[PDB]
Every structure is written in structure tokens, then in C-alpha cells.
Amino acid sequence: PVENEAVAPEFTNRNPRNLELLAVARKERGWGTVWPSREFWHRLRVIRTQHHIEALVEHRNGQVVVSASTREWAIKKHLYSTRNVVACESVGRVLAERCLEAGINFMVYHPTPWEAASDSIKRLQHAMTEGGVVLREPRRIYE
Amino acid sequence: SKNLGGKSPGKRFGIKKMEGHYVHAGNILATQRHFRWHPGAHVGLGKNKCLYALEEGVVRYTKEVYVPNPSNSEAVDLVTRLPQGAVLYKTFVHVVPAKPEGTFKLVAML
Amino acid sequence: SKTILVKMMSQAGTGFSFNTKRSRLREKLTLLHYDPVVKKKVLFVEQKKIRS
Amino acid sequence: QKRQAREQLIEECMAKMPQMIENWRQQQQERREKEQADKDRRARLQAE
Amino acid sequence: VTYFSSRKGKRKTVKAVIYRFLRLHSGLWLRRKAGYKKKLWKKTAARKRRLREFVFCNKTQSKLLDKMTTSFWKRRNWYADDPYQKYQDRTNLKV
Amino acid sequence: LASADWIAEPVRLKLAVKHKNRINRSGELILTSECSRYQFRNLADCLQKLRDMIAEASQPAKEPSREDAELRRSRIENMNRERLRKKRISSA
Amino acid sequence: RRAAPLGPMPNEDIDVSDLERLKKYRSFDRYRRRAEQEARKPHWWRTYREHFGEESGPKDRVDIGLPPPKVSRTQQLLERKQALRELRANVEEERAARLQTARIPLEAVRAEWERTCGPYHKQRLAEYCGLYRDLFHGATFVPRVPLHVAYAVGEDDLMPVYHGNEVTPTEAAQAPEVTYEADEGSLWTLLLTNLDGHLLEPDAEYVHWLVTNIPGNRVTEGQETCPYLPPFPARGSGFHRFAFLLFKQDKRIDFSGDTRPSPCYQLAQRTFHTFDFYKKHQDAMTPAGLAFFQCRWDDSVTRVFHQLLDMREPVFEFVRPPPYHPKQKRFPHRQPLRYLDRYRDSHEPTYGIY
Amino acid sequence: RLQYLIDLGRVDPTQPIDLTQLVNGRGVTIQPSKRDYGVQLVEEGADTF
RNA sequence: UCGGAGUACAAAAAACCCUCCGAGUGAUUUUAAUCUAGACAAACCAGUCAAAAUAACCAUAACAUCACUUAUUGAUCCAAAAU
């Protein structure tokens, strides 16, 4: 035969990002006495300080994967009034960009009822949508 | 007589699987009249407030910070009246999943 | 006050029935229920009075 | 003939459905607004 | 139960059993749940389902029903179209 | 597939498009059935599969309708890799 | 029977005496914050983090880096303060703010980010995707030099490879354009590795494209050790990850050991351990640039296996473990009839002697 | 069972095989009293037949 | 007969013509589907949860809610209904 033809029956895929992209991996179902839902591969987290707006994308490990902050000199220097609605929109656009660049198209966003009504965050979500990142992750397969 | 009908059997509320046990998906971990143990990772809550495993694995109990759902009035009020350093803790049940999600097998070599 | 057990019928033309407890002094009951044969959410109107 | 009768009945009444449930929805909404208008026209006549 | 009949001197069957149970050939008996037709409006969907089941009897009951029933009801039957023919044998039972 | 004359040329070409996944590097189309313990039933399943493939390929009226259930990921990740691909300067 | 707490109890600090004089958070949100901070501390009791795999927890990081750029703190601070004074000064800007009309020149932000904190973000993305775990095994480096890789999809089309992004093997059929900034006394080495998708060896990877002794920014001028081989995942397995590594080397290094034949379509010839390869040349080579992408099987790949590697094409499935059933009982009690079907071998009647 | 019966020459394939032939080879047993309406043919040995 | 608290101090169970409260339902609309891994509970009968999968609906839309929620209930046969 061919020395190339050797395969082995069970293929090992070491890539941690894999099963998530395939949608076949395990989310964490559970909690549901508490809040927010911990069920997701990726979660958008928006922290608003009295000064800066910080948008993180998290993995259930707690590990921050890709983020955009207003403390960041790149964003800080271009625009004005770090705490403004404007800033939220901005950070949203930046984050969408970096997300696409990172290969993650899906994340969950779980705001508070009053953060849902707020303009800054509505426009953050808008910015994130036009950026091509979909909130509301795809379902699991054989969940 | 004055006193009547005190007689009813025990409901057998308790905790069915214990820390370190092996479980299969759907096993009831505990059952309770009020929340004593809260459901943690991979643990579903029943409508009768009982906890059951959603994944095959090992049961673990844990203490953790409790951050109630903002749709729940009572709990938010309780949290809001706390002194500024304080943090509510509760007891949780998890299942650490054992089997890998699935494997990759060689179907056919074309 | 007493309640009443009424038989409720689909307007989907499918014969299908489900019984409901309804207030005696109230109006004739009308609901949107699930009909299994048509597999839809349809309108049910009370046909008959079963139990009192 | 029985099967075709059943199917006929079902198609006939399934064609009539959106009209029926919409009509009943308007009926109930009109009922609600009738009762609320009654309670407001009573509230203002009691206030005066 | 009549162990020795009068005319034939044989052992009679208790028909009241034959009406409510079903004997598979393996020795498993099958029964309906109790109260499954009773007061349905008052019950949960889930409970209704739990009632609509066909269920198996524990060993004790099985031996009891066997004793209450003659040999004829234990024969291997082949019915045309029979729903239950699928279930008569037992498979992979390691005991 | 190429050497099979009992099927028309347009059909023989469309088959090599839709089913190229199950085609072999030696040019072989390969069907497989599993279910029954009786290989009569298996053979019958294969032959019925083949009949159906030839049937849908010989129909020009086939619109190849795709569901959005498992393809939503595909469309969105496609579009979103097309946002990056959009950089225009010639290379090589 | 009471035991004694080991270390501090959580709320033992605040005074219960005189609750009315204590400040409370009347905000749900303040509470949420304080709680999430509390959930990040290393407690002495069994916790979620403990069981659910913080992944080695505390880890002392062997760092093979390029030394961080030396910049004056105070000077930089002054300049930035000034810039922000100037920017805040304008009335035009404030008008842009109140009326909710403003835009950020994204390209410039991307440039600044690439220049400043980019290396760290790219680093933690690499950590996330386990680049470091499969390459140097323990080792983290910050990608000091930005690496710009792109593919030609056509005449006017350019497909960039950012860290972690997805690319189709069709796009990658040709060797990519590579760009980074260095003057020339310089020597570099570029490496393209398929981290998974080695068929025989779970711990080993494939070298696709290895180039060496690279003067300055000049890509083609360097001698190619291993000629470019297009990405070839396998049909079943999803998303293999490819890694572009950039090493800054001092001495010219020559390896006849690592050199491969010109066509090199044998798989046993491209088998690679980034670890070992780095151990060898460790003294001269310091890893600098990094960019990597996610890639799944697509049509074009079929052509590879047949045409280049002279192979049959392996296809995989995703197989889930068979469902767990309890030991079968002789008299299943109070169990639905369908019980007997769970232990059924195959659905087909079998008439034993009949 | 039919094949096994022919192989050992209990029923002979030469002449036509009906119920009486199956009974006479004791390949099968019918008891009409139990409402047996006859033999039915099943496919268990199809591949080997 | 059924439920809650004590008796029964921390898994379960646990008696008295023991100590105390209750239940034999309201009110409301969110009218709450089918099917099935695995379990709780258990002498038996009865009770309980429940993933995945279907179908319903935003077009990846299945826990009726409140009253301490726990209890608001009754087997076979047999009768009435016709589905």
C-alpha cells in the first residue's frame, strides 16, 4: 500500500475551539435559581463605570477572550466624553470588528430589564448587529 | 377532642445522591420542600423544587455567591437592603461531566 | 358560589372535547385551545354542560 | 365517503378560522373597553 | 380458585383475571393502570400519560395470576396482525 | 459513473455534482445500506436509493430547496468572512 | 458538634450592632458587582472554580519573548494629557457628542491597537485557542511584531488571516502574502503548522510551509525549507487550526536536517514538533510574530488527497456514545411495555426453531 | 426450517408441497382445535435458501 | 381521609383518645400538546420529577399564576353519555 494511507480509526482533534463551532459541544445547562443564565459558549458583558464603558466577551471559564475598553488609548484618544452614549456605540463597533477578526460570530447578551430600555445599550446592540455579530447563540445539537 | 388530624406520613425529602457519587442523566440528586440546595452546573430544577442531573458524571456540592434574578421582587429587595460589604451565599449541586461529548470515528476511506 | 364542569368543542370541525371548570354565574365560555387532529391553536366554544 | 366528509368539514372550518378568532378578539376587546369606559364614566360622576 | 372441578375433576380458571391482564409467553404479565378512565378533567397532562400506560407486574403478582389461571392461557399463540407478538420472547437477559 | 450508459448524459453529469461526496477517486459511485439482517432488504434499499437519485436528477424541475435550520450558521459565517475578504488590493 | 472555621468567614467583618448606621447598596447592580468580585477570590471551601477546571489554576509562565519596548512613563502621560486637552477643547466635538452624531475612524484605531495593546490581546486569544499548549507546551510569548498575512482569492480579492479567523481551503490553495516591519541587519524564519489533522500521531502536527533566513521584510528572498502545501483537513473532523509563527534570529542558521525535498508530497516527511524544532535552534531563534486561522473541509480539498498525496480520501463522523440502560430485570415492575424494546437487539422477528 | 427439511429429505421438492406434506415430515404441527388456520411462511432463512 | 409545625435537636423513617394550625377550594388568564432516556417514592394499589425528539405559536417561542401551596380528594364493577 501507500505509506501515506495510514490513518488510525479514531481521529484526535486537540482544538478547544472546535466542538463549539460545530455546535455539538456542551453548554452549561443549570443554575436557574440564580442569574444570569450560565448556558452559552460566549457571553457579551458590558460594564459601565461612572467614567469608562467596557465591553468584554467572555467564555464560561470566566476567561476574557476579546474585549474593547474606553481606558484603551487607541479608543480613548480618538473620541470625546468616555462615558457618553457615543462611546457605547463606538466600543460596540470596535468590538464587532475585533470579534470578526477573532472568528467568533455568536454570543449571548443578558442585560438587566432597565439596561434593555437604556439608549446607550440599545445602540451598543445595534452597533454589534451591523458589525455582523449575532447575539442569541445557535442551539446545541442533540442537546 | 380538641386536637385532630396531625397524622400524615413523612414526604421523604432529602438528598438522594451524595458528594462523589456517579450519576446518569436524569437521576434525581435531591428533593426538598423549600430551597435548601440550589441547582448548579448541569443540574436541572424541577417544578416541585427538586434537583436532577442533566449530564452523566460526578456530583459535587459547593458554597457560592447568590445573585437572584432581577425579575424576582422579593430576592432583589433582600439583596438591596444588605450592608455594602455583604454577600449572600448559598449551597449548590453540580455534576462534573465524565464522558467526552462524542468522538470522531473513521467511516470510509474513499 | 358553585362552579360547573362544561364540555368544550372545537370550531375546527374536528370532533374534539375537553372539560373545564367555569364559574356558574359567568357567561358562556369561549377559549383558544390546542386541537391535536388539526394540530393547531383553534377556537373552542362550550357545547354542553356536563357536571354541576 | 366518511373520510371525505371529515376532510371536507375540516378544510371548510379551517378556512373560516382567522375570521372567527379575529372577530372574537375584537368582540372581547370591545367588551373590555366597554367595561373600562363604564368604570371611568362612573369614576368621574362620583368624583363630581 | 377451584382446584378440582365437580364434573371434570380438572382445575378451573378465574375469568376475572383473563379479562384484565395479558400474559406474554415469557411469563411477564401486562395490565392497565388503575383509574385511567376516571375523572380526567381534574388531572395533569403528565399524570394522564402516566395512567395511559401498559405496565408490568412484579414477581409476586405474576405467580399469583399464574396460579389463578389454567395451562391454556400460557400456550404460545401466533395471531395474525398481533400487536404483541413482538414482545413474547425475552432477549439479552443475563441472570 | 462515467462508464454507465443506461443513464442519459445530462443526468449522468448532474449526479456527479449532487452526490460527489459518495463518489470514489476511481470514478465509482458507491451506495450502502445497513438496516435489515436480510440482505434482500438491503439490496432493495440500495436499489431504491439509486432509483430515487436518478429520479430527482432526471427531473429538471428540482429546485434544491435548502432549510435555514442548520444553514443559518453557514450563511452568517459566510457573510461575515465576506466582510473581511472585502479588502481590495491585487496580490501575486 | 461544632467545628472551627478555617480562615475567615465571609460576612464576619461587618458590625451587626447598629445596622441603621451602615451604608447599604440600594442598587441591584452594585450588589451584582460586589458579588462577582467575591466569586473571583481563592476561598478555603469547596468551590465551583476548583472542580470545573481553572486549567492548572496558578501557573508560573516560562516566557520566551521579545523584550517589551522601553518607553518613558511620564513623557507619554504628559503627551496624552495634552492630546485630550486639545480634543476636549473644541466646541465642534461637544456638538458631535450631545446630538448623538459621531464616528470613530476605525482604521486608525486598528493601527493604534496593533501598535499598543494588540500583542497582549493576540496573546490571550492564542492562549484561549491553546496555541501555546500544543506548541511550546508551557510557554507564553507576546507577539511583539505584528504579522500581516493575506491570500489571493482573485485579482481584486484579498482574504486576511487574523488570529482565530475562519478561511476556506480554496482561498489557501496558493502561498500567502506576508508583511511585517523590520530594517535589515535582520534575519527571520516563518513557519506554517497544521496543529491537528495529523492522522497517525495525536501529539504531532504537519509542516505546511517553512521559510528561512529571511532578509528584512523580504519574503521570497529567503531559502524555502519546506515548499507551500495547501490546507487539507479531513471531511468529518471540523476546524483544524493553522499557525503562522515568526521567529527573529541572530546568526544565519543552516539546517540540512530540517530540509525537505522540493515536491515533498509524502506525509511521513512532513511531520513536525514545534517544540523540538524550537529546542534545536533555541539560542538564535526568538519567536516574535503570530497569526493563525480556523479551517474546515471544503470541496477543493478532495483534489489534494487524490492528485498530490496520491491517497484515498479519509472521511470521519461524529459518534456519540450509546445511551446508558440499567441492568435488565426479570420482572420489570411498573415499567411501560416499551421497556422490553430498550434491550432489544435489532428490530426483526426471529423464529428460533420455527 | 423448510430448507433443513428438504436437505435431510423429509419433504421432497420434486412433488408439490402442501400442508399434508409438511405435517407428514413433522416439520410442522397443526391443531385446528386451537383455531390454527394453517401454516404461514416467514423469511428467517431467505438469504441461505 | 388528606396537609403544615412540634414530639422526631444534624440522611430517611417513626407512635399516642399526644401538643397546635389547617383542607373537602376559590380567584385569575399565561387555556397549560404529543412522545420518551433516566430516576424519586413505594408491601400492593396509587403517587412524584424529567433531558433529548416531534407539533404549536416570537417564525432556533412547552414550569399556568396567586391565596403559609403543601392539602382541596375516591379503586373496581355498574350506570348514563357517543367519540
Ligand SMILES: [Mg+2]
Ligand atoms: Mg407530623
Ligand SMILES: [Mg+2]
Ligand atoms: Mg404516620
Ligand SMILES: [Mg+2]
Ligand atoms: Mg401449535
Ligand SMILES: [Mg+2]
Ligand atoms: Mg428508593
Ligand SMILES: [Mg+2]
Ligand atoms: Mg424538550
